[PDB]
């Protein structure tokens, strides 16, 4: 799996590798010995890059997290550039850096983190909304962000700051002028803010309508009431995933009970 993902990553054909990344791995092939941790980390790192390229940050963040939580005793080159991308992807999808699992290896907390200090500083700036200050840091540490080849993932953090601030205006406002809107988010122009809101509505990240006559934006914030047959099917689909997931948990539990080693203790 690591080799296939790597091959489709060098020559960019991401679509063929999708069926082997959309399934939840539950077993690891022993392969008659060998199979060191390098192959396991490679699959859950090259898979993160593949999802990141397709702008699927929800599952890309999941893949990077699995690589970090791998038990380890020494810093590896393939794990160092996964804490770094874990921060950037979490800043794009979520509003902040997500908390790592409690059972992560101690090597990441003592050795991996100090090397990744430009990304940690980027997260610190990405806690008080100020695009101008974060712009300076990006152009200051630009040599580091371009050496690790994760350039173009920091520029998306720039855009995500503007979109996050607009998504915050819906928590306090109901109708805002375009001129006034491009003064708290530092968009510097009603025309610029007009297209920023228009893009976000099409993506679905906000519910709003633009009134060009008065130059205002009205935030509806009323997506849907839960009285639909489509929502009933949506809940049922979530039901079948959990029901079938529990069945495979029970199956693997039963095989433990009939294990000759288990019965002794």
């Amino acid at each position: 799996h690591a080799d296939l993902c790597q091959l489709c990553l060098l020559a960019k054909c991401f679509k063929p590798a999708l069926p082997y990344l959309d399934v939840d791995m539950m077993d690891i092939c022993k392969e008659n010995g060998a199979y060191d941790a390098k192959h396991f980390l490679c699959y859950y790192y090259y898979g993160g890059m593949i999802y990141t390229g397709l702008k699927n940050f929800e599952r890309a963040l999941y893949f990077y997290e699995q690589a970090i939580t791998t038990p380890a005793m020494a810093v590896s080159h393939i794990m160092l550039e996964s804490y770094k991308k874990y921060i950037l992807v979490s800043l794009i999808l979520l509003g902040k850096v997500q908390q790592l699992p409690k059972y992560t290896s101690q090597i990441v907390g003592r050795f991996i983190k100090p090397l990744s200090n430009a990304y940690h500083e980027l997260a610190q700036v990405y806690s008080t909304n100020n695009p101008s200050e974060l712009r300076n840091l990006v152009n200051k540490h630009s040599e580091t962000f371009t050496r690790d080849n994760n350039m173009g993932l920091v520029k998306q953090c720039l855009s995500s700051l503007y979109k996050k601030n607009i998504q915050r205006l819906t928590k306090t406002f109901l109708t805002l002028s375009l001129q006034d809107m491009a003064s708290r988010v530092q968009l510097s122009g009603p025309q610029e803010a007009e297209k920023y809101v228009l893009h976000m509505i099409e993506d679905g990240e906000i519910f709003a309508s633009i009134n060009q006559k008065d130059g205002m934006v009205s935030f509806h914030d009323n997506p849907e009431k839960y009285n639909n047959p489509a929502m009933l099917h949506n809940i049922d689909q979530e039901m079948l995933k959990c029901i079938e997931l529990d069945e495979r948990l029970k199956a693997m539990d039963q095989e433990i009970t009939v294990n000759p080693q288990f019965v002794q203790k």
């Binding site: 941790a37 380890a72 109901l174 805002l176």
Partner: protein
């Protein structure tokens, strides 16, 4: 800045001794054209009252601002030391006579000299020994008075908190069953009143006023202690900031014990009454004028900024509480600001604070937003299901990596 309502008669008659100097020593020196006249009255007192160390420590600055008796302070230093040694020998005679009755006044009298002398660091350690020689309930009553007053005078708050808890449990849970419903003298009134001053420094405004409001005016006027004037101000301002409408009515508005303190301070009484009666423009305006006067204090100065912000926040929430949609022009006038400034203050109160509303900047109307209970539960339950399934899959992979014993070596 003018102080026409504050006559010098009320200013001087409130404090006594050298505790006045530490009040205007540094904060009151940042306002020109006002200390110069007070220096005339300071030139009559600071020489007296057994001042030895502070005689030269503070006067060195004012000397350069400009004959006198420079040799007057020389003689005082030498004579003071001789007096303490003379009476020590007489005390030791009673101890050697095996008379436990006469030694009782010895330890109490010796600790008294420490306070007036100026050196108080040795009094705290001496008072620790006196605790051991106290087996009767009568002896416990006397030594409790000294320990409370000396702890504050040194400003060691960490030790104050650890030591004041001992005084709570030591005297058999408040003298057994209360000794037939309290004594004639309201000693407990003084106990809480001292605690009220300490709690304010601990950044606990609610507990400070809570343990300051039950004060009985039976003491009337005590020249030997702090004035009642600042007691009303300290209790009133902490009352407005921390307790809600129900507690304010129960403990300040309708409590017929604290109103007597409001008589000697009429300004704070108008503050609380107008706040209760939903009159905000008058309440905030005269509060703002009073701010300059309080800024010259030594005790309320590090709390003026915090308390005022809390009071204004309470006013904003209480103003919008009865409304479902409130015009911003009426609100701006009632809060001494403009519509533009009101918008910026309400956004902070909507993002995190208690206000649940949505500002409409087109017509300048603050609409109240009510969350939909049914949709909220569906959103949270589906979110929990999504998070739970992600955790289950991650744990499932963790089981595989544990069985296979995979690690980076």
């Amino acid at each position: 800045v003018e102080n026409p309502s504050l006559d010098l008669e009320q200013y001087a008659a409130s404090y006594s001794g050298l505790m006045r100097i530490e009040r205007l020593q540094f904060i009151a020196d940042h306002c020109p054209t006002l200390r110069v006249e007070a220096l005339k009255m300071a030139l009559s007192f600071v020489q007296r009252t057994f001042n030895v160390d502070m005689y030269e420590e503070i006067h060195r600055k004012l000397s350069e601002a400009t004959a006198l008796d420079t040799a007057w302070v020389e003689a005082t230093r030498k004579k003071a030391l001789l007096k303490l040694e003379k009476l020590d020998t007489d005390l030791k005679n009673y101890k050697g006579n095996s008379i436990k009755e006469s030694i009782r006044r010895g330890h109490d009298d010796l600790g008294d000299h420490y306070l007036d002398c100026g050196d108080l660091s040795n009094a705290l350690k001496c008072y620790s020994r006196a605790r051991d020689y106290c087996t009767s309930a009568k002896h416990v009553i006397n030594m409790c008075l000294n320990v409370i007053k000396v702890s504050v005078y040194l400003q060691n708050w960490s030790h104050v908190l650890s030591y004041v808890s001992k005084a709570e449990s030591t005297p058999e849970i408040a003298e057994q069953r209360g000794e037939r419903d309290s004594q004639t003298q309201a000693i407990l009134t003084k106990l809480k009143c001292a605690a009220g001053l300490a709690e304010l420094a601990a950044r606990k405004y609610k507990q400070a006023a809570k343990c300051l409001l039950l004060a009985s005016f039976d003491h009337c006027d005590f020249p030997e202690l702090l004035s009642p004037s600042n007691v009303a101000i300290y209790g009133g301002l902490c009352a407005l900031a921390t307790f809600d409408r129900q507690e304010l009515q129960r403990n300040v508005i309708s409590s017929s014990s604290f109103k007597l303190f409001l008589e000697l301070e009429p300004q704070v009484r108008d503050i609380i009454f107008k706040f209760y009666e939903s009159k905000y423009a008058s309440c905030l305006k005269m509060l703002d004028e009073m701010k300059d006067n309080l800024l010259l204090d030594m005790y309320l100065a590090p709390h003026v900024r915090t308390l005022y912000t809390q009071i204004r926040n309470r006013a904003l929430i209480q103003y919008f509480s009865p409304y479902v949609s409130a015009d911003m022009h009426r609100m701006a006038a009632a809060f001494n600001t403009t519509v533009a400034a009101l918008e910026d203050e309400l956004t902070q109160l909507i993002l995190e604070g208690l206000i649940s509303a949505r500002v409409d900047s087109h017509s300048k109307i603050l609409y109240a937003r009510d969350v939909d209970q049914r949709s909220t539960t569906f959103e949270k339950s589906l979110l929990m299901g999504k998070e739970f399934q992600r955790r289950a899959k991650a744990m499932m992979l963790r089981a595989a990596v544990l069985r296979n014993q995979i690690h980076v070596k």
